[PDB]
Design an enzyme around this catalytic site. Structure first.
Site, PDB file in Angstrom:
ATOM      1  N   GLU A  35      38.199  60.796  84.109  1.00  0.00           N
ATOM      2  CA  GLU A  35      37.088  59.856  84.723  1.00  0.00           C
ATOM      3  C   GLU A  35      35.584  60.399  83.960  1.00  0.00           C
ATOM      4  O   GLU A  35      34.750  59.425  83.511  1.00  0.00           O
ATOM      5  CB  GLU A  35      36.957  59.558  86.095  1.00  0.00           C
ATOM      6  CG  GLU A  35      37.823  58.742  86.744  1.00  0.00           C
ATOM      7  CD  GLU A  35      37.733  57.144  86.559  1.00  0.00           C
ATOM      8  OE1 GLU A  35      36.883  56.850  85.635  1.00  0.00           O
ATOM      9  OE2 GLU A  35      38.638  56.593  86.962  1.00  0.00           O
ATOM     10  N   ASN A  46      29.757  48.538  82.913  1.00  0.00           N
ATOM     11  CA  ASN A  46      31.048  47.663  82.652  1.00  0.00           C
ATOM     12  C   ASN A  46      30.384  46.224  82.082  1.00  0.00           C
ATOM     13  O   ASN A  46      29.416  45.725  82.351  1.00  0.00           O
ATOM     14  CB  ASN A  46      31.807  47.374  83.850  1.00  0.00           C
ATOM     15  CG  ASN A  46      32.527  49.025  83.952  1.00  0.00           C
ATOM     16  OD1 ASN A  46      32.085  49.305  85.008  1.00  0.00           O
ATOM     17  ND2 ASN A  46      32.905  49.546  82.940  1.00  0.00           N
ATOM     18  N   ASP A  48      31.080  43.169  83.183  1.00  0.00           N
ATOM     19  CA  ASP A  48      30.821  42.799  84.297  1.00  0.00           C
ATOM     20  C   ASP A  48      29.416  43.032  85.064  1.00  0.00           C
ATOM     21  O   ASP A  48      29.095  42.392  85.873  1.00  0.00           O
ATOM     22  CB  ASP A  48      31.810  42.914  85.367  1.00  0.00           C
ATOM     23  CG  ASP A  48      31.967  44.167  85.956  1.00  0.00           C
ATOM     24  OD1 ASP A  48      31.067  44.997  85.750  1.00  0.00           O
ATOM     25  OD2 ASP A  48      32.674  44.010  86.948  1.00  0.00           O
ATOM     26  N   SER A  50      28.349  45.712  86.188  1.00  0.00           N
ATOM     27  CA  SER A  50      28.477  46.891  87.304  1.00  0.00           C
ATOM     28  C   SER A  50      28.506  48.297  86.306  1.00  0.00           C
ATOM     29  O   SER A  50      28.755  48.039  85.110  1.00  0.00           O
ATOM     30  CB  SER A  50      29.604  46.833  88.257  1.00  0.00           C
ATOM     31  OG  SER A  50      30.859  47.087  87.427  1.00  0.00           O
ATOM     32  N   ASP A  52      29.675  52.639  86.671  1.00  0.00           N
ATOM     33  CA  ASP A  52      30.406  53.526  87.269  1.00  0.00           C
ATOM     34  C   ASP A  52      29.596  54.825  87.281  1.00  0.00           C
ATOM     35  O   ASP A  52      28.948  54.941  86.412  1.00  0.00           O
ATOM     36  CB  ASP A  52      31.778  53.880  86.429  1.00  0.00           C
ATOM     37  CG  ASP A  52      32.677  52.669  86.449  1.00  0.00           C
ATOM     38  OD1 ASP A  52      32.710  51.814  87.382  1.00  0.00           O
ATOM     39  OD2 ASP A  52      33.342  52.347  85.420  1.00  0.00           O
ATOM     40  N   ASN A  59      32.420  52.639  91.212  1.00  0.00           N
ATOM     41  CA  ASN A  59      31.712  51.355  90.637  1.00  0.00           C
ATOM     42  C   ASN A  59      30.569  50.616  91.580  1.00  0.00           C
ATOM     43  O   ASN A  59      30.818  50.657  92.846  1.00  0.00           O
ATOM     44  CB  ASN A  59      33.112  50.689  90.209  1.00  0.00           C
ATOM     45  CG  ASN A  59      32.484  49.238  89.558  1.00  0.00           C
ATOM     46  OD1 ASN A  59      32.223  48.081  90.419  1.00  0.00           O
ATOM     47  ND2 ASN A  59      32.528  49.395  88.411  1.00  0.00           N
TER      48      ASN A  59
HETATM   49  C1  BUL Z   1      36.441  54.303  92.040  1.00  0.00           C
HETATM   50  C2  BUL Z   1      36.150  52.856  91.945  1.00  0.00           C
HETATM   51  O1  BUL Z   1      35.041  52.556  92.077  1.00  0.00           O
HETATM   52  N1  BUL Z   1      37.148  52.085  91.921  1.00  0.00           N
HETATM   53  C3  BUL Z   1      37.216  50.592  91.521  1.00  0.00           C
HETATM   54  C4  BUL Z   1      37.401  50.270  90.183  1.00  0.00           C
HETATM   55  O2  BUL Z   1      36.333  50.989  89.362  1.00  0.00           O
HETATM   56  C5  BUL Z   1      36.791  51.174  88.168  1.00  0.00           C
HETATM   57  C6  BUL Z   1      36.410  50.185  87.121  1.00  0.00           C
HETATM   58  C7  BUL Z   1      36.582  50.988  85.758  1.00  0.00           C
HETATM   59  C8  BUL Z   1      35.847  50.695  84.701  1.00  0.00           C
HETATM   60  O3  BUL Z   1      35.868  51.432  83.967  1.00  0.00           O
HETATM   61  N2  BUL Z   1      36.168  49.274  84.368  1.00  0.00           N
HETATM   62  C9  BUL Z   1      36.305  48.761  83.072  1.00  0.00           C
HETATM   63  C10 BUL Z   1      36.011  47.392  82.746  1.00  0.00           C
HETATM   64  S1  BUL Z   1      35.036  46.738  81.578  1.00  0.00           S
HETATM   65  O4  BUL Z   1      34.502  47.939  81.096  1.00  0.00           O
HETATM   66  O5  BUL Z   1      36.190  46.797  80.706  1.00  0.00           O
HETATM   67  O6  BUL Z   1      34.177  45.956  81.868  1.00  0.00           O
HETATM   68  N3  BUL Z   1      36.165  52.504  86.332  1.00  0.00           N
HETATM   69  C11 BUL Z   1      36.067  52.499  87.873  1.00  0.00           C
HETATM   70  C12 BUL Z   1      36.945  53.786  88.032  1.00  0.00           C
HETATM   71  O7  BUL Z   1      38.260  53.908  87.577  1.00  0.00           O
HETATM   72  O8  BUL Z   1      37.164  48.754  90.042  1.00  0.00           O
HETATM   73  C13 BUL Z   1      37.653  47.923  90.767  1.00  0.00           C
HETATM   74  C14 BUL Z   1      37.673  46.599  90.380  1.00  0.00           C
HETATM   75  O9  BUL Z   1      38.273  46.608  88.855  1.00  0.00           O
HETATM   76  C15 BUL Z   1      38.028  48.463  92.150  1.00  0.00           C
HETATM   77  O10 BUL Z   1      39.258  48.012  92.568  1.00  0.00           O
HETATM   78  S2  BUL Z   1      39.263  46.789  93.845  1.00  0.00           S
HETATM   79  O11 BUL Z   1      40.145  45.925  93.388  1.00  0.00           O
HETATM   80  O12 BUL Z   1      38.815  47.613  95.215  1.00  0.00           O
HETATM   81  O13 BUL Z   1      37.920  46.387  93.925  1.00  0.00           O
HETATM   82  C16 BUL Z   1      37.951  49.926  92.587  1.00  0.00           C
HETATM   83  O14 BUL Z   1      37.102  49.834  93.528  1.00  0.00           O
END
Ligand code: BUL
Length: 129
Positions: A35, A46, A48, A50, A52, A59
């Site tokens: 990570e 991200n 969206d 948000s 990290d 997130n």
């Molecule tokens: C630890 C934490 O916050 N986990 C949450 C995770 O967070 C991710 C997103 C990822 C990110 O890199 N996303 C990529 C998306 S994009 O960049 O392609 O936009 N890096 C973070 C850690 O892995 O996002 C969720 C919704 O997808 C939540 O699941 S949930 O169902 O509880 O809410 C979990 O709460």
């Protein structure tokens, strides 16, 4: 701060992460590695709106407040900036709240991808913990 792998293993073991909600220590070191590369100042925006934050890449849509995330809930009750300190206390307290949810450690995409079902022996090898 960029933690050394064993340095991080010892801080996590000292803070009760070994076995937290049934997640052994190596799970926690493996996910920090993939990570954030062990960097507490890591940030990732991200698609969206948000972001990290920190060593665990928590997130901003659900766990912390960064003041610029659309429909944010701030379940850990903190400013996301607190997730970026060299001191892991707040990051650990919030990671601990995140794994209590139904999805457990599978909340972390990098855990699902690089650690789930693997031999994680190597992440704590040589740490003497
Ligand atoms: C630890 C934490 O916050 N986990 C949450 C995770 O967070 C991710 C997103 C990822 C990110 O890199 N996303 C990529 C998306 S994009 O960049 O392609 O936009 N890096 C973070 C850690 O892995 O996002 C969720 C919704 O997808 C939540 O699941 S949930 O169902 O509880 O809410 C979990 O709460």
């Amino acid at each position: 701060k960029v933690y050394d792998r064993c340095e991080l293993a010892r801080a996590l073991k000292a803070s009760g992460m070994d076995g937290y909600a049934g997640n052994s220590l190596p799970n926690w070191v493996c996910l920090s590695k993939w990570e954030s590369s062990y960097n507490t100042q890591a940030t990732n925006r991200n698609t969206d709106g948000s972001t990290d934050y920190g060593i665990f890449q928590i997130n901003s849509r659900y766990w912390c407040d960064d003041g610029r995330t659309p429909g944010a809930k701030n379940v850990c009750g903190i400013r996301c900036s607190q997730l970026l300190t060299d001191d892991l206390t707040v990051a650990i307290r919030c990671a601990k709240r995140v794994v209590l949810d139904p999805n457990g450690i599978g909340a972390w995409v990098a855990w699902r991808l690089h650690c789930q079902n693997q031999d994680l022996r190597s992440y704590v090898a040589g740490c003497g913990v």
